[PDB]
Amino acid sequence: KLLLANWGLPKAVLEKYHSFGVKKMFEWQAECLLLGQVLEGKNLVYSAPTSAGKTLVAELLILKRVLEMRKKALFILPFVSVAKEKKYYLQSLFQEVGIKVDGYMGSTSPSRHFSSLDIAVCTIERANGLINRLIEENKMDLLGMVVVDELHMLGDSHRGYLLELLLTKICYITRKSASSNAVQIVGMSATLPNLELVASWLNAELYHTDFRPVPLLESVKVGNSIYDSSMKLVREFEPMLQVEDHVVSLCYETICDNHSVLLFCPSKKWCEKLADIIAREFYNLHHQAEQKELLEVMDQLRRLPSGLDSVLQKTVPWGVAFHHAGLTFEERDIIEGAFRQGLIRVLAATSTLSSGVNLPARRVIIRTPIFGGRPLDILTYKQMVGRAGRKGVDTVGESILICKNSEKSKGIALLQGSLKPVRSCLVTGSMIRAILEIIVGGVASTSQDMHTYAACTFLAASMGAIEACVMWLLENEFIQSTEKVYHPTHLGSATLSSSLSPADTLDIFADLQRAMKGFVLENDLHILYLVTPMFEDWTTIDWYRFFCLWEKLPTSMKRVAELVGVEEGFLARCVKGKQHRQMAIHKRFFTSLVLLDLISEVPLREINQKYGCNRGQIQSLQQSAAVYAGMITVFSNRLGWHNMELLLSQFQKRLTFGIQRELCDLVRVSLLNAQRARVLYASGFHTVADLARANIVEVEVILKNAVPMRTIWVTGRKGLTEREAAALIVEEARMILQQDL
Amino acid sequence: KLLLANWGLPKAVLEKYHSFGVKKMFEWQAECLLLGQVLEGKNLVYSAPTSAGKTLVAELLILKRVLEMRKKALFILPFVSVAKEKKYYLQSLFQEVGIKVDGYMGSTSPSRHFSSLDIAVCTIERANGLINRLIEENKMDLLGMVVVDELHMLGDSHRGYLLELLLTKICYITRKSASSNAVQIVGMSATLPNLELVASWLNAELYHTDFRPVPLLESVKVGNSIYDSSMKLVREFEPMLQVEDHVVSLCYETICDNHSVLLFCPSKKWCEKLADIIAREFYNLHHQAEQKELLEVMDQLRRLPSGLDSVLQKTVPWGVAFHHAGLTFEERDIIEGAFRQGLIRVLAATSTLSSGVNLPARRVIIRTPIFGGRPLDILTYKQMVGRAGRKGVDTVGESILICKNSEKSKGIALLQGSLKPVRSCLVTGSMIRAILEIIVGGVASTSQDMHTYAACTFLAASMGAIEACVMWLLENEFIQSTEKVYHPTHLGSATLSSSLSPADTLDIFADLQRAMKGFVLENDLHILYLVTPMFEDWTTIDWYRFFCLWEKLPTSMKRVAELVGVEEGFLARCVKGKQHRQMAIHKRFFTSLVLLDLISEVPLREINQKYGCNRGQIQSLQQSAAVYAGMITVFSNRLGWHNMELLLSQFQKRLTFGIQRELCDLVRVSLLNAQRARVLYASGFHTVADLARANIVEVEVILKNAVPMRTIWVTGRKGLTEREAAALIVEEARMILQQDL
Ligand SMILES: Nc1ncnc2c1ncn2[C@@H]1O[C@H](COP(=O)(O)OP(=O)(O)NP(=O)(O)O)[C@@H](O)[C@H]1O
Ligand SMILES: Nc1ncnc2c1ncn2[C@@H]1O[C@H](COP(=O)(O)OP(=O)(O)NP(=O)(O)O)[C@@H](O)[C@H]1O
């Protein structure tokens, strides 16, 4: 029974599963999938280590649900990058079966309707919106199963509470319809201490396991000695070659064993220093002073829109590199992609890689127990050390945390500690949106029926302020009260449909209605100023630069500032020598200035040295501001503002790819991000129409030129050959036009 | 040789010509078509009376040109209504031949490209723009023949000068390309005294004839006697029944002879009085106190968007009616259509019908020699009296002009007078556009080459200020000068492409750029305020109403007024008790207010009693403001303003049909003007897509209701049955979607 072909599976899916190297099913997976009555409708929650094969159980369950009862199945993932990876994996597994898979990851939206789709690999922030849309116009029959990844995120997190509200809405809808099951909620988590309470929250059966494909031997350093988890020496450390910490040696010993190493570092600047240091040691310690495939990685990074990083130039062709937030989104994918093939053997990464894609390694080394002035989180530590040990190759997995002097006490607590139990995070902004997500949906109107929903939440299931949320919504016109029955309003129907927090919608409605009387149209700044999300922590603002920004702006760009409350008298002037709502406007104004150059196709290299924020912190905004333009536009339609939806209709597409209005039709094909379309635009193909009929060999020469074998990089496809990439552009264009009419 | 089938013609065209009652060719037409070498390339100009068969020669020539050398052939007509009639006639003649005919009449634009088209039945104002577009991007090879109707209009007229510039541009292009002919210019005119000079202007051969199918016996009244043209009594008048002028008797004598009468009147108010008077006499003089088809006309006018006119209620079912400018555009077509079938036997019309469609009658009576305080124009008189005598039925044709006391001297001069020779009307606004139409087109750049064009104009060919036009264009940035070679600018390339007079473009560029900094989006007023043409003489403005207009406008509509220079202190306030640019703003503001209700689908009955201007003067603006929005939008694209072209893209379609943004896709089918789409919209079909797939029998019931056998009226199709009209809606929708992709 522990064999995949024995289980009922499609032939093509099984063959592709062999192609991915998965053909042996562990005992824990079979036991979880044989937990009695789970399969035929009841929801399920299980825990396993990060490398135990958590995905396979969910994939088998969603396959069984899909081919048994035809119904749309969700797939919730916490991060956009992992969501894209999961969608591509599911497509590569499900091409033939006819299960059309596509995802809703922030800026991007499917061309085909959700009814045509069958599996929606969606992020939490947009899965909430999709389920709100489904619940709105009574389309619940299509949904048949919601799959959630990393259930433990529903605690203290910026987006796990959205997952909590989504799951409680689904549970309440299921309970109210019964006054074996319509929608099955299957989730995966780490070693959650209170998973029984979570399992009872959805009344799901629980199966917790600690099976690991390879043993994990966590260890700590003391001078020239290594101590195991339980304060026990396991191996007497000795240095091989170095020119107390000796962090370069631990990489070296694994290097001579023909394996790889992950070297997590606290800060990006530390990552650049550490990657450079290890590269220099590879000169003297290996030369006393695959290569061919490693040069291909260099070639792929050479004609990236940002070019090749200066620090990466002196490090990459040695198996030593670095990968953190400040790097480009395309640069990160290549560097991570090189690790999957083993081309790069050392990665000096930050804490961002902890929650990233599945990146295996033989050894994991963590430089400091303090990350950004605070002790490193246990949840992050478990995710970091969960990457030690490659399945089927490495016989063991080692994690080495470096602690010094008095800091060793904090380090030891991490090894013997356990991840904290989940919380509720529920007046509060989470409950206000929770209440508004139902009444405007019309599912529950009466207070008593609404109070039933309050008993279906996570806070109630763990074992006042619920009615206070209504009183806040009533005072702000969001919901009107009649004989008490609560009805949605024009503003309320817009907050829910656009998927905005009610705290923000109040200001946006006042901010957008401040554009009722005064507007400009020469420059996109004022229109862009209405789609900048916030200042948050996207970058550090340099005011002396803003002094240069303010004067050199044309006579129009300064006019926009006066129209939005920005004062010329105090603009980078009084800050040098030394109001919360006013400070959040000048910083918001600066955020709009950067986005203006982003849609003007100013290259990221220039925009970095000009606005001081590197490409990592800039794509962290344009892919976050593109979603904002996709919610302000929806906010206007539900409020009956057809004038500005027309203006803001194309600004989500212009911010996602950083293009102008000319390439809007051209960037529809997925193989032209921001440079493969302009160089193709200059060749005379101004629309996706004639590009489909364009000559196959003609587009080869145009893509060859304009350089700032598989050197062309494609989103989600790693690197691609120049001939293959250009051949797929016309092939994809033919399908795009054919399926759109 | 005087027989159509003898001439080389397609079989289907010949059969349709028999269907239209034209099978005998007069001697003058054959002589004109056998004027030696005219046929194989040389242009032609000929004159004939209004009923002599002027169209047939042009139709034969354009047919020969089209089937001999495949090339696009123009068809220029002076008025929009006659252009629509000519386009429909040409389509009804040319369905089978494959000659795709379509017209460019102001607001409407062809869905198919001009390259697909073969005959463009275009008005002068848009024929000029089409030829400018053709000359711009060197597409002159497609054009092979330009046909012009009423050549004599190129004199003192508001749009004949555009025809003059068009023809001189064509002639200059032909002459410059020769440094039997590419483009043949064939035109028709009345008895122009100086047609030889016009014929030599295009070097065309001239054939002037005075043949008339029926003799015309013009006559004048004196008390109870009738005098012929040459001061000779021809018949002693006697009154039959009346309850000196005795204008009701002349209708009566023709009535008992089973014929019809046209009774032209000076003013609309006179027309209502005269039509009512004759109807009352038909009570006592015919009852001492076809009917079935006459009631059908009443039924068609009963559910018109404006309903049935009060004055028409007491007059229509007796053969007596009236038709002037103040009536609805749809009302005029039915009243005129009833005359073609003979249902209505008396028409009290104004001078507007003189240049309208071909409306024949047995007798024509003109009430006064003074029209609006001035002597009646001889050109109008010839057009008015040219409708006397129906070909093949009436043995004679009579025109009776009524003169009294000392006014008889002026009346006699009209009978013995002749139509004045054409003029040039060429600093002047006609020459400024003439010069700009070429240099921005790039055809002529050097001054000497430009001076060659000045010798190809009508003023030169009849036998300084040409260089002064360049000096005016240079001072206003319209054209830049280098080493002298004149180049177009950004503003210059927009004035020519949008087809605006350079005098107006200077203000529009300043007016539109006054919207650079201050704009509103809640209401369409400010956007509509940028597309109102002018105040002109569209209606008389009542200021006390504007006082009611100003206060009851919302807090936003008053904000728009402040943004465009309108002052609250002086707004319908100082005019009651008693600046040219300021007066043309408040009047322009009032023009925008009316258009706001026009796009809000406020019914014409309410909008008449609310804004005091009847439906005749209101559709005289919305079909003139729709063209303006079609030129402001083009003016923005050539000037690189993509923000407001998006806002103004749909405002030409919203003003042509007076619809909202919901029906924009629905009104694409020609059988839904402004009421057949809303009542169909309320049935659930929100788009032209599902309307094509809509059930045939289902749309029958929805069109039957909402009434404010062939009762449904279709533009250009007279009246249509309810079953046929609804059946064609789905049939047309199927072809619209199929041919658009
Ligand atoms: N029974 C199995 N035997 C061998 N390999 C397996 C088995 N089951 C799953 N796998 C694979 O081994 C990996 C261990 O599972 P797991 O690491 O939890 O997935 P994951 O990292 O969460 N993938 P993702 O959702 O994209 O982040 C899976 O991702 C599969 O690639
Ligand atoms: N040889 C002919 N014999 C009989 N009828 C003719 C002949 N030639 C033309 N006709 C028709 O008699 C009418 C007299 O010509 P004419 O009145 O000048 O056309 P029109 O009124 O200018 N048509 P339009 O261009 O739509 O305004 C034509 O319109 C034709 O309908």
Curated annotation (Swiss-Prot), chains A, B:
Residues 244-454 form the Helicase C-terminal domain. It is found in: Nucleus; Chromosome. ATP binds at Q29, A48, P49, T50, S51, A52, G53, K54, T55. A motif (DEAH box) lies at residues 149-152. Residues 35-454 are annotated as: Helicase activity. Highly expressed in testis. Phosphorylated by PLK1; promoting interaction with TOPBP1 and recruitment to DNA damage sites. It comes from the Eukaryota. Residues 709-741 are annotated as: Interaction with RAD51. Residues 35-210 form the Helicase ATP-binding domain. Transmembrane segments: none annotated. Homomultimer; forms homodimers and homotetramers. Interacts with RAD51. Interacts with ORC2 and ORC4. Interacts with RHNO1; interaction takes place during mitosis and promotes POLQ recruitment to DNA damage sites. Interacts (when phosphorylated) with TOPBP1 (via BRCT domains 7 and 8); promoting POLQ recruitment to DNA damage sites. Low-fidelity DNA polymerase with a helicase activity that promotes microhomology-mediated end-joining (MMEJ), an alternative non-homologous end-joining (NHEJ) machinery required to repair double-strand breaks in DNA during mitosis. MMEJ is an error-prone repair pathway that produces deletions of sequences from the strand being repaired and promotes genomic rearrangements, such as telomere fusions, some of them leading to cellular transformation. MMEJ is required during mitosis to repair persistent double-strand breaks that originate in S-phase. It is linked to Breast cancer: A common malignancy originating from breast epithelial tissue. Breast neoplasms can be distinguished by their histologic pattern. Invasive ductal carcinoma is by far the most common type. Breast cancer is etiologically and genetically heterogeneous. Important genetic factors have been indicated by familial occurrence and bilateral involvement. Mutations at more than one locus can be involved in different families or even in the same case. Belongs to the DNA polymerase type-A family. The loop 2 region is involved in the binding of the 2 ends of resected double-strand breaks and homomultimerization. This is DNA polymerase theta. It comes from Homo sapiens.
